[PDB]
Amino acid sequence: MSIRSLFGGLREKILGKNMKIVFPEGNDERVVRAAARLKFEGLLEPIILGQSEEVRNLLTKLGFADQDYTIINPNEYADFDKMKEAFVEVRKGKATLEDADKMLRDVNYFGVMLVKMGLADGMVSGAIHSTADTVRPALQIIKTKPGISRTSGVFLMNRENTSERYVFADCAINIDPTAQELAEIAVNTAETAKIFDIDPKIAMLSFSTKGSGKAPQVDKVREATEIATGLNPDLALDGELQFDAAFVPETAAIKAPDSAVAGQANTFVFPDLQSGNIGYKIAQRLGMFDAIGPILQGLNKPVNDLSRGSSAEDIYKLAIITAAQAIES
Amino acid sequence: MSIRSLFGGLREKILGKNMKIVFPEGNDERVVRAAARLKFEGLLEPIILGQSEEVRNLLTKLGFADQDYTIINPNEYADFDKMKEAFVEVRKGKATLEDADKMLRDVNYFGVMLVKMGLADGMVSGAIHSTADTVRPALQIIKTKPGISRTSGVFLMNRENTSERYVFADCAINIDPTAQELAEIAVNTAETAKIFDIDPKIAMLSFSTKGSGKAPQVDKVREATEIATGLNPDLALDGELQFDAAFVPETAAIKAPDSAVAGQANTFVFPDLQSGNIGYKIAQRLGMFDAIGPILQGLNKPVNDLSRGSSAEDIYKLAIITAAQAIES
Numbered sequence: 001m002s003i004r005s006l007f008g009g010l011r012e013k014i015l016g017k018n019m020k021i022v023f024p025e026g027n028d029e030r031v032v033r034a035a036a037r038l039k040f041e042g043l044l045e046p047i048i049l050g051q052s053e054e055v056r057n058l059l060t061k062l063g064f065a066d067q068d069y070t071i072i073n074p075n076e077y078a079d080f081d082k083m084k085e086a087f088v089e090v091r092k093g094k095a096t097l098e099d100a101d102k103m104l105r106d107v108n109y110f111g112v113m114l115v116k117m118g119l120a121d122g123m124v125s126g127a128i129h130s131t132a133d134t135v136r137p138a139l140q141i142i143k144t145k146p147g148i149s150r151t152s153g154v155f156l157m158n159r160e161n162t163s164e165r166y167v168f169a170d171c172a173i174n175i176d177p178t179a180q181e182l183a184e185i186a187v188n189t190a191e192t193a194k195i196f197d198i199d200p201k202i203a204m205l206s207f208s209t210k211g212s213g214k215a216p217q218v219d220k221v222r223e224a225t226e227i228a229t230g231l232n233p234d235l236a237l238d239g240e241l242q243f244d245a246a247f248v249p250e251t252a253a254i255k256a257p258d259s260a261v262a263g264q265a266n267t268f269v270f271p272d273l274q275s276g277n278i279g280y281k282i283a284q285r286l287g288m289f290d291a292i293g294p295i296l297q298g299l300n301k302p303v304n305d306l307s308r309g310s311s312a313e314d315i316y317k318l319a320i321i322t323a324a325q326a327i328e329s
Numbered sequence: 330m331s332i333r334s335l336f337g338g339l340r341e342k343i344l345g346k347n348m349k350i351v352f353p354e355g356n357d358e359r360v361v362r363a364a365a366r367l368k369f370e371g372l373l374e375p376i377i378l379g380q381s382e383e384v385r386n387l388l389t390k391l392g393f394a395d396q397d398y399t400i401i402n403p404n405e406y407a408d409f410d411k412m413k414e415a416f417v418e419v420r421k422g423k424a425t426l427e428d429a430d431k432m433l434r435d436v437n438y439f440g441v442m443l444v445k446m447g448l449a450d451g452m453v454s455g456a457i458h459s460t461a462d463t464v465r466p467a468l469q470i471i472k473t474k475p476g477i478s479r480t481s482g483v484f485l486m487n488r489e490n491t492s493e494r495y496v497f498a499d500c501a502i503n504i505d506p507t508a509q510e511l512a513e514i515a516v517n518t519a520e521t522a523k524i525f526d527i528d529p530k531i532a533m534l535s536f537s538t539k540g541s542g543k544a545p546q547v548d549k550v551r552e553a554t555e556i557a558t559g560l561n562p563d564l565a566l567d568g569e570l571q572f573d574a575a576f577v578p579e580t581a582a583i584k585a586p587d588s589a590v591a592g593q594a595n596t597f598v599f600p601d602l603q604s605g606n607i608g609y610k611i612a613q614r615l616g617m618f619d620a621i622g623p624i625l626q627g628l629n630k631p632v633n634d635l636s637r638g639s640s641a642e643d644i645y646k647l648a649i650i651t652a653a654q655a656i657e658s
Binding site: 171175176205206207215217242243244247248254270271272273274275276277278279281282283284285286287288289308309 | 500504505534535536542544546571572573576577583599600601602603604605606607608610611612613614615616617618637638
């Protein structure tokens with residue numbers, strides 16, 4: 001079960017389903033060469049943003065056919081009206097046709113808008129903008145799914161030479177989750193994990209294992225664990241587990257017997273951003289796991305953010321994941 | 330630079346210096362066989378606690394010589410007087426000769442006491458007791474060093490096949506450090522790191538690198554970093570670094586240029602117990618580093634706690650570390 005097998009699986013899931021993804025960054029040649037690649041492999045239709053002629057130039061500058069791309073210019077939009085309205089039609093108080101005309105100019109807002117207006121199934125951005133410039137419009141226009149209150153960023157942790165595939169607990173968005181949010185993040189992750197062929201066995205991480213440590217942050221995790229089991233009884237979830245108790249059978253046997261998850265987890269939810277962000281990077285660098293970029297979860301429509309300094313292949317992969325997400329919709 | 334090499338170094342540092350370590354657990358045969366080993370190798374003099382005849386029995390039941398061990402019985406102490414007093418003489422209000430006669434009965438208290446009263450250079454316990462039962466007396470009787478307010482537990486993270494040796498930031502004691510405590514912990518760590526032949530390059534970990542993230546917890550790390558640089562200007566300390574920025578040169582170059590530490594740290598200070606305890610365990614299990622058990626730092630006299638289910642070799646190593654510590658005193 002390699003990274004190539006994993007993507008051969010996601011690729012079969014979206015091939016032909018003609019999903020449409022918006023690529024705000026029609027500037028960056030990485031995005032273009034990835035869009036181009038996805039388009040002619042039959043995986044999705046790219047909706048590139050930028051001055052029609054401009055982007056069309058980069059397409060040839062990079063040696064690509066010049067026609068058939070669905071390029072759209074935010075400034076010059078053949079319907080910047082229906083859209084400029086649909087915007088205030090969502091921000092009421094802040095809703096302001098005079099504002100909308102200036103904001104929906106920004107390639108990201110425009111993109112999110114195009115998705116909100118059912119004009120595109122999803123979006124991939126962030127190769128040239130801050131995470132905020134993608135996560136913000138996405139939260140205002142499209143929003144959290146009905147059952148969730150906050151988004152989270154999961155990392156597909158793969159280490160093929162060892163036959164190991166895991167998922168990690170918001171290592172990007174929530175600074176310090178609420179037992180409530182933490183439970184939503186957990187329930188949310190298990191659904192994402194499924195997209196990557198994982199059969200969840202969630203462990204709520206802490207520095208305590210079933211009461212071995214005592215503190216408010218410990219309570220927050222146990223609490224969340226409980227709330228999670230409530231939200232969805234069918235998940236294999238176990239709460240207040242230290243990493244070792246979640247990962248190795250010898251310790252679980254001791255620290256957490258009778259556990260449906262301990263000793264064999266594959267889905268790890270972290271207490272807070274500090275632990276999660278530091279944690280996955282340790283697993284990546286010291287553990288040598290490949291970390292498939294932040295994948296946002298819990299939106300009505302999928303919108304993902306690339307990283308500072310990604311590759312065209314990186315974009316290609318993210319978009320595939322994005323489309324595969326728009327299918328669960 | 331192997332674990333054996335590392336211990337052949339610590340062993341040279343304490344051979345002949347006749348340090349005396351107290352072993353409260355005269356019950357456990359692991360401790361006994363370890364004490365026994367340490368004794369006849371010329372590394373330190375064990376001071377075993379328990380019924381003189383009892384422990385002496387286990388010494389033969391395990392095939393060892395029966396004489397010359399400095400065994401002491403807490404109940405029947407040939408000076409339970411000078412001591413019972415030296416106790417209230419430190420707890421004033423709560424200081425109570427009627428209490429002291431009952432408390433200093435407990436093998437750990439007794440041991441801490443023996444160390445307090447200059448009767449022993451250090452102590453190693455915890456093969457049969459909770460961490461609490463060792464860290465508590467140690468805190469009441471012996472206390473934090475003059476420059477520190479709280480103790481912390483560092484982990485020597487060794488991975489010889491890769492030529493990598495690191496130290497980790499309180500992954501055992503402080504639930505959620507104060508920018509002040511956090512700074513102390515860091516300054517404290519750097520001193521310990523030297524005992525293990527490391528030349529500190531400290532990184533204060535966060536989910537943010539030099540302002541890339543914004544939150545109260547981010548401020549706590551940056552603040553600490555500052556207070557740290559104050560406490561000791563000669564340390565190679567750098568603040569508010571994500572793990573990747575602290576460990577890999579490629580990312581430091583980007584996220585934190587002009588950094589004396591980024592890209593080459595070897596000493597890692599974690600924000601809070603959650604990130605530290607989960608983190609070192611990840612590095613241990615997924616990263617395959619050997620993690621030399623919790624080593625307590627910041628005491629006038631060294632007092633370490635073994636782990637739940639340690640081996641005689643483990644005890645042997647801790648004690649050596651302990652002794653190497655009492656030398657810096």
